[PDB]
Amino acid sequence: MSVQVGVIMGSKSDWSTMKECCDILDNLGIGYECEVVSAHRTPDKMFDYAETAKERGLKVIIAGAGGAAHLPGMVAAKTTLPVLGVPVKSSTLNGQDSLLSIVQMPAGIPVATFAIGMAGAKNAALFAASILQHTDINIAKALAEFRAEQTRFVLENPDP
Amino acid sequence: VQVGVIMGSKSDWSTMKECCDILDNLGIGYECEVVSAHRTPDKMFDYAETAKERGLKVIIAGAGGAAHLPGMVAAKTTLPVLGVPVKSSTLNGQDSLLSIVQMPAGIPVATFAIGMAGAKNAALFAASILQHTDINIAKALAEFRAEQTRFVLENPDPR
Amino acid sequence: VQVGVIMGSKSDWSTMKECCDILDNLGIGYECEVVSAHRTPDKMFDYAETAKERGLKVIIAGAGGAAHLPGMVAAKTTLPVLGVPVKSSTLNGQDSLLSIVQMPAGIPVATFAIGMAGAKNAALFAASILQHTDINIAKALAEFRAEQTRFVLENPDPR
Amino acid sequence: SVQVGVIMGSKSDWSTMKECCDILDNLGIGYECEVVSAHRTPDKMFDYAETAKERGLKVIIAGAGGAAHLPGMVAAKTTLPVLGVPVKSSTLNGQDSLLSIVQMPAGIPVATFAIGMAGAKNAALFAASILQHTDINIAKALAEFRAEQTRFVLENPDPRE
Amino acid sequence: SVQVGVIMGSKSDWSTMKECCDILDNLGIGYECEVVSAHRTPDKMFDYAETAKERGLKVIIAGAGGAAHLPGMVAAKTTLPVLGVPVKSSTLNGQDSLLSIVQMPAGIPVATFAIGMAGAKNAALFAASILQHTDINIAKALAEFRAEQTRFVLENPDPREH
Amino acid sequence: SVQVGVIMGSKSDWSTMKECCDILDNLGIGYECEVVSAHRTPDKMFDYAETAKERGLKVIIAGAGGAAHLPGMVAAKTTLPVLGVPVKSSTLNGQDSLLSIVQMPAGIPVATFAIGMAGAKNAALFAASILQHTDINIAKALAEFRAEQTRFVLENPDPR
Amino acid sequence: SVQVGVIMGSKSDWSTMKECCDILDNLGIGYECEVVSAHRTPDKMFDYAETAKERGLKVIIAGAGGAAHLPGMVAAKTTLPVLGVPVKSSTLNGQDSLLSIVQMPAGIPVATFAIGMAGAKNAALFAASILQHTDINIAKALAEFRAEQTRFVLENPDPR
Amino acid sequence: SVQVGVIMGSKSDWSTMKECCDILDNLGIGYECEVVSAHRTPDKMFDYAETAKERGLKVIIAGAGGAAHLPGMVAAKTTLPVLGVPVKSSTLNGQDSLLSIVQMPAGIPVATFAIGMAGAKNAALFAASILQHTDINIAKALAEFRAEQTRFVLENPDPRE
Numbered sequence A: 001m002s003v004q005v006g007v008i009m010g011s012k013s014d015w016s017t018m019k020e021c022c023d024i025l026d027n028l029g030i031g032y033e034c035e036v037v038s039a040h041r042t043p044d045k046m047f048d049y050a051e052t053a054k055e056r057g058l059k060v061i062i063a064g065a066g067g068a069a070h071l072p073g074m075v076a077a078k079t080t081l082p083v084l085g086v087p088v089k090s091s092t093l094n095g096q097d098s099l100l101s102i103v104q105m106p107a108g109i110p111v112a113t114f115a116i117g118m119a120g121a122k123n124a125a126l127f128a129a130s131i132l133q134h135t136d137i138n139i140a141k142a143l144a145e146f147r148a149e150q151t152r153f154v155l156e157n158p159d160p
Numbered sequence B, C: 001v002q003v004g005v006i007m008g009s010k011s012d013w014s015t016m017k018e019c020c021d022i023l024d025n026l027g028i029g030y031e032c033e034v035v036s037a038h039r040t041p042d043k044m045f046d047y048a049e050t051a052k053e054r055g056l057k058v059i060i061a062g063a064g065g066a067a068h069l070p071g072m073v074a075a076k077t078t079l080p081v082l083g084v085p086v087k088s089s090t091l092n093g094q095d096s097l098l099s100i101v102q103m104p105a106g107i108p109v110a111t112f113a114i115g116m117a118g119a120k121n122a123a124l125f126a127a128s129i130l131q132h133t134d135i136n137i138a139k140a141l142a143e144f145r146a147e148q149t150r151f152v153l154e155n156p157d158p159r
Numbered sequence D, H: 001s002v003q004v005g006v007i008m009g010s011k012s013d014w015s016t017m018k019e020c021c022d023i024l025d026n027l028g029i030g031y032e033c034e035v036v037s038a039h040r041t042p043d044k045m046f047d048y049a050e051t052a053k054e055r056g057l058k059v060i061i062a063g064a065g066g067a068a069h070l071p072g073m074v075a076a077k078t079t080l081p082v083l084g085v086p087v088k089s090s091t092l093n094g095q096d097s098l099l100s101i102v103q104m105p106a107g108i109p110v111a112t113f114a115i116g117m118a119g120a121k122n123a124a125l126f127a128a129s130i131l132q133h134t135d136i137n138i139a140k141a142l143a144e145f146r147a148e149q150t151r152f153v154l155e156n157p158d159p160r161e
Numbered sequence E: 001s002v003q004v005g006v007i008m009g010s011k012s013d014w015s016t017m018k019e020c021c022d023i024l025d026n027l028g029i030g031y032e033c034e035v036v037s038a039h040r041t042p043d044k045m046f047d048y049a050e051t052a053k054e055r056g057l058k059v060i061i062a063g064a065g066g067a068a069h070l071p072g073m074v075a076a077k078t079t080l081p082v083l084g085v086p087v088k089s090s091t092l093n094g095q096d097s098l099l100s101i102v103q104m105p106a107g108i109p110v111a112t113f114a115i116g117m118a119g120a121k122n123a124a125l126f127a128a129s130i131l132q133h134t135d136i137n138i139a140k141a142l143a144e145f146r147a148e149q150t151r152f153v154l155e156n157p158d159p160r161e162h
Numbered sequence F, G: 001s002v003q004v005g006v007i008m009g010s011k012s013d014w015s016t017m018k019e020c021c022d023i024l025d026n027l028g029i030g031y032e033c034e035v036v037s038a039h040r041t042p043d044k045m046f047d048y049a050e051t052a053k054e055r056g057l058k059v060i061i062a063g064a065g066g067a068a069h070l071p072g073m074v075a076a077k078t079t080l081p082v083l084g085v086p087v088k089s090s091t092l093n094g095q096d097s098l099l100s101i102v103q104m105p106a107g108i109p110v111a112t113f114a115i116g117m118a119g120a121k122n123a124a125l126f127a128a129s130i131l132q133h134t135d136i137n138i139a140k141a142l143a144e145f146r147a148e149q150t151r152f153v154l155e156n157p158d159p160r
C-alpha cells in the first residue's frame, strides 16, 4: 500500500492506544507510517515532520498525546494537511487534560478531535479512511464493508 | 456545493454563521440549513442518506446540550462529518462537547472547539480536505494562513 | 410485553440486566434487545416507530459515552422513554449522563442515575407508570418498597 | 381536573418552574403550583407527598437548586411518579442540583430532566406523555405540540432568513 | 454518656463511618451508630432527628453518598448541629455526595467535611471540638490527640527513614 | 460579649461575609469581624488563632476564595471550632475555594458550608447551633429564626 | 536592562498580561512584551525561544488561552525558566488554559500560576524572586512590595 | 552545599517527592528532604520558611495533597521562590491538590507543576534552571539531561518491536 497516513505519538507509552489506530488502517488497506515524535522533547523533529509531510506524499496525519497535549496542534500549525487528534488517557485526570489541550484550538488552526483513548484512536483511522475514500476506490470499498459488517454484527446478536 | 452546513435550530446561527463566512472567503460552495435531530428526525436521516449523491463532500453539523445531530448524521453517511459544539447557556458547552466527541469506536465525528472558534475551524478543516482536488481552494487557504500569520507579525508590541 | 428494554451494545448488559431483573420480580412483561443508534440507525427508527402498535407502554434505553440512543428513540415515539446512563471507562459516565439528560425543550428523556442504580430505578419508575392501570403491579411495587424499608429497619446496627 | 402537582423549594424557582406550568396550560392539563420547601417546611413536604394520590394527583413535578432534596424526598413518600427539574443555581450553574436529583441510589427513582427552563418544559411534556394513555384530549394536545415543533423547522429551513 | 448520634444511609457506608466511631471511642466520647435511610426509611429518619435533643444527643454525624440527602433532611428536623460526611460514591468518587451535602441554601446548615474516611475522622474530631466546651475530659482528650499527631511528625522528619 | 470571630482574607470578601455578620446581629450574638490574610499577614493570622480561646471566642468563621487557606491554617492553630465559607471566585465560581477548604486531611477539621452568601448565612446559623447549648437566649433566637422561615413559606404557598 | 520577556498568543491577551508588565515596572525590572502566537507564528515562536538567552533574557513569561501551547513550546526550546499564565477563556473560564499549561509530562517544566490576572501579577512577582539573587535593587523592591501589601492589611482590619 | 529544600506534608507523599530528589541527585544539586506538615506542625512550618534563606536555601519545593496549603503558606513566609507539587489524592485524582496550590491570589506566588510524579520531576528540573546561572556544572548537567531525553526519542522512532 502507498504511504498516505502518518501516525505519530508523543512517547512510546502511547503505543498501547495508537496501535488500535494502526490496526484499523491495516485492515482497510491504508498505507501508513508510524513514528514517535515528541512535541516537548523533539520539537525540531516535530516541525520537520510536519513541514515535509505533504511533499512526502502523506494526505492525513493522526497525532496522539496526553496530559498537556500539544503535538496535534503544533503539527497542524506547520502543515496544511488535515490533522486528527487522539487524546490519550492520562493516568491522573483520565484524559480530560488531553481532550481540552487538543480540542480547544482557537480559530485559524484546526485539529479534528476524537474520543479519549482507544475509541478515538480507532475513530481517527476510520475518519482518515473517509477522507481518502473520495480519491481511492479500494479504500472506499473497504470502508463500506467495515460499516456493513459492524451493522451486521449487531443485527445478528440482538439478545444480550 | 461541496459542504453542507447544518444545525439543530436557528438559535445556533450566531455560532454557525462564522463557519459560513469562512467558506465564502475561501470560495467554497456550500448550503446551510436547520436540520433538527430531535424535531425533524426523518429529514435528518434523508439529508444524511442523500448528501453524497447530491455531491456533498463534507458535512459540518452544530448542536448544543445533548448534541446528537453530528453523531446521528455520521451514522447515516460515509462522508466525513465535522462536529461543532454550540455553547449551551447552562453548562458553557461542556455537555455539547462530550455529547459530540465521545463517539465510541465505529462511527467517527471530527470535533472542534466549543462555539465560534470550532465553527471557524470546521470551515477551515473542510478546506484542508477539499484542497487536495481543487487548486483555487489550495491557493485560498494558503493565503488565509499567510494573512493570519502576517497579521500577528505586523503587530508585535501590543502596547 | 409492556416495557421495551434496549441498549446500544452487549457490553451494556452487565448494567441493563439489573433493570430486567426488577421487571421480572414485579411481574412486568418486557423484552430486552441490543439496538444501536450509531451502528443500526434504521433498526432503531423502526423499533421506536412500531413500539406503540406492538403493545409497549414504556421504553428503557441505556447507552454510554456519546449516548444518543434514548434521545433519538424519544424523537421517534410518543411513548415515555427512560434513559439509563451507562458507566463509561474513561469519564465514569459523566459523558453518558450529560448526553442523555440535557435534551432541549420539545422531546423529553426521563434520566436516572449513572450505572446500575439508574438501571434498577428505571425499572421501578416504569412500574410506577404502569401501576395506574393494573392492581397486581401496584401491589408488587408497594411490596418491593415495603421489603426495602423492612431490610433497613430490621438491620439498624452496622456493627 | 387537577392531575399534576408542580412544586418548588422557593419562589426564586418560579422563573424556571413557570415555564413548566405554561406548557401544562397550553396542553390543557390541570395542575396546581405550590411552594413546598424540603428544608424549611419538611412536615408540609411529607404531608403533600403522602396525600397526593388520594387528592387525585397522578404525577408530581418538583424543582429545586443547590443541594436539591425536594424531588427525592417527595419520591420517598409517594408511589406516584416524580419528575425532578434541576434549577440553575447562581454558583455552579445547576451542576450541584443535577447531581443532587439524578444520582438517586436504587430503590426510590426520580425522573430527571435538563438543568433550567429546558428541563421545566420537558418535565411538563413528559407528564403529558404519561397522562395521555388515559386522556384523549391530552394525547391530541401533545401530538399537536410535536407536529407544530416539527412544522416550524421544516418551514424555516434557511437560517439566513 | 451518649452525646453523639452517628447515622448513615446504608450498611455499605460502614467502612467509612466506622473510622468516625473509632475516633469517638479513642476520645472517650459516648455515641450510638445506626443505619437510617432518608429515602427508604424517611419516617424513622424524621423520628430520629425529632427526638435527638430530648434523648440527650448534642451532635449528629450523618454520612451518605450519591444524591446524599440524609445530612440535610436531619438538619431540617433538629436544632442540633449536624455534621455531614460525603461517602465516596463508586461512579463519581463522591463529587455527587459532596455537592448534595455542602450546597445547602441559607436557613438550614450542614457542616461538611472531606469526601470519604478523611471527612469521617474529621467529623468526629469536630464533634469533640463542640463538646469540649462543657466536657473537661473531652477537652483533655482532644488536646492530647492533637499533641500526639504533632509529635508523630516531629519524630519522623526524614522521609527516607526505613 | 464577643463569642464569634468573623475573619476573611481580604476586604473584597465583605460583600459575602457581611451576610454572616448580619445574621449574627439578628440572633443577638456578639462578634468581631476582621480582615486577616493567610498569605499577606501570616503572623497576624497565627496570633489571632493562638489567642482566640484566651480572648473569649467560642467559634471562628473564616471566609476565603481561590486557593483558600485561611480556614484550614486557623484550625491548625486553635482547638476552637472553625467554620469555613468558600467565597465565590471570579474565575472558577468558587470550585477552587470549596475544594481548598473542605478537603482537609484527617487531623484538623474545618466545617465547610456552601459557596458564597448561602454558606456565609449558614456558618452564622451553625455558630448559633453551637452556642445555644450553653446560652438559653441564643437557643430561643435560633428557634424563632427557624419558626419565622418555616412560617414565611407556609404563609406564601402560591408563587405567582 | 531587559531580563524578562513577556509574550502572549494574541493582542486580546493584553488585558490580562498588562498586569504582569505593570508589576515589573513597579519593581524596576526591565522587560519586553511581544505577541508570539504558537499556532499562527510557530517559526517566530521557535526563534524567540532560541535566541532569548543570548539576548540576555533570564526569564520568559508566556500567556495563552484555550488549547494553550505557547508556554510549553517555548520551554521546549530554551533552558531559561518559563512561567505560564493561563488566560481566562470565554467558554470554559480558563480550565482548558490551566490544564493545557500545567499538565506538562516529566522533562520540560512550566511554572504555572493562577487563571487570569491573579496569575499575571504573580508571574511577575515570581520572576522577581528568581532575579533577586542576582540584583540587590530587585531584591529590595520585592521586599518592599511585600512589606506594603502586608502593612495595607494590618492598617485596614475593619472591612465595613 | 544544600541549595534546595524539598518538603512535603506527610510521609504518604514520599512516593511522589522521591522522584524530585532523584533528579536533584542526578544533576549534582545539593538538597535536603523533610516532612513538614502545614496542618499538624504549623510552627515548624513557619520556622522552616523563616530560616530558609539564612540556612543557604535558594529554592523550596513543597508537595501536598487534598486541601494543599503547604506550598502557599511557605511562600507567604519566605522571599525565596517556592515550587508547588500537587500530590495525587485518592478521592479527586489531585484536582483538589492542583486548585489548592495554583489558584494563589495576587501578592504571593507559587510556581505550580503537574499533578503527581511528573510535577515532582519537573519541580526539580525547574529548580535547576533557576540555579544553572550559578554553577557551570549545574548548567552542563541540565543541558545533558535534556539531550539525553531527546536522544531517547530520536534514536527509538518506531514504537513497534
Ligand SMILES: O=C(CO)[C@H](O)[C@@H](O)[C@@H](O)COP(=O)(O)O
Binding pocket: C094, C097, D092, D095, D096, D098, D099, E092, E095, E096, E098, F095
Ligand atoms: O466541584 C466539583 C468536583 O468536586 C465539580 O464542580 C462538579 O461539578 C463535577 O463533578 C462535574 O459534574 P458533571 O459535569 O458530571 O455534572
Ligand SMILES: O=C(CO)[C@H](O)[C@@H](O)[C@@H](O)COP(=O)(O)O
Binding pocket: A093, A096, A097, B094, C094, G092, G095, G096, G098, H095, H098
Ligand atoms: O472536561 C470536562 C467535562 O467534565 C471539564 O470541563 C474539565 O474542566 C475537568 O477536568 C475539570 O478540571 P479542573 O477542575 O481540574 O480544572
Ligand SMILES: [Cl-]
Binding pocket: G009, G037, G038, G039, G064, G065, G067, G068, G069, G070, G071
Ligand atoms: Cl497557545
